[PDB]
């Protein structure tokens, strides 16, 4: 098996949001075909971060979704050789991130390079004051164009106060080889900050992530 029942990765990531650069670097472990996964995260540049550390979990890991086999899985098909993708964000309130991610494997460990630019979020808004509380579970759309997986994602953070701070993602997902494409399908998540220290230099995530066909 080129992807193993359990798995680790690395991820690194570096970017600028409102002109703050920062770089984070993560060890993660999980079970692709169970869609399970966790990481530890470590602000290595830049911290403790200015930011919401919600802005940045959803760009620190595909491989660890669950597809039943009657939906071809074009990310655990891209191995050996990996993937690429492209993200936005556009947030209720005008602010933008962009992201880029390479995603290739060392033996039974991932490896994912994560860029990141965010700008324009408002120096009074919930990002740049801490007030978010993590996202809400989510269902992202996806479907296949000329080789490329799109998928689109209507996604909200959760508010102090009780409530929400909408951000739509687009992605494009690019696999390094020809793979299997598959039919219109949707990707059900939950994503949450199980534990952080109390300046966000040390961080802790979980995934479920689990395929199924559209309606």
């Known amino acids: 098996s080129v992807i ?14 409102n002109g703050h ?18 990481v530890k995260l470590t602000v290595t540049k ?23 086999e ?11 050789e990996g993937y690429t993708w492209e993200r936005s964000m556009n947030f209720e309130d005008g602010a933008v991130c962009t992201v880029s991610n390479d995603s290739s494997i060392q033996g039974n460990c991932f490896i994912y390079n994560v860029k990141i630019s965010g700008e ?20 992202e759309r996806l479907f296949a164009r000329d080789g490329m997986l799109i998928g689109n994602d209507y996604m909200a953070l959760k ?7 909408l951000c739509e993602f687009k992605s494009t997902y690019k696999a390094k080889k020809p793979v299997r494409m598959p039919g219109r399908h949707e990707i059900d998540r939950k994503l949450d900050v199980t534990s952080h220290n109390r300046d966000y230099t040390s ?12 309606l």
């Open 120 to 139: 324009n979020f408002p120096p009074n808004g919930p990002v740049m004051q801490k007030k978010t509380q993590g996202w809400e579970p989510s269902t």
């Open 203 to 214: 961080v802790e995530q979980c995934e479920i992530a689990i395929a199924r066909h559209s």
């Open 21 to 38: 650069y920062f770089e984070v670097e993560g060890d993660g472990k999980g079970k692709p075909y169970e869609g399970e996964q966790t």
């Open 159 to 165: 508010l102090e106060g009780g409530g929400h701070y």
């Open 46 to 68: 830049g911290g403790p971060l200015p930011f919401a550390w919600d802005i940045l979990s959803p760009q620190l890991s595909i491989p660890f979704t669950k597809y039943p």
């Open 70 to 80: 009657d939906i071809p899985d074009y990310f655990k098909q891209s191995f050996p």
């Open 4 to 17: 193993a029942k359990q798995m680790t990765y690395k991820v690194y990531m570096s970017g600028t949001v």
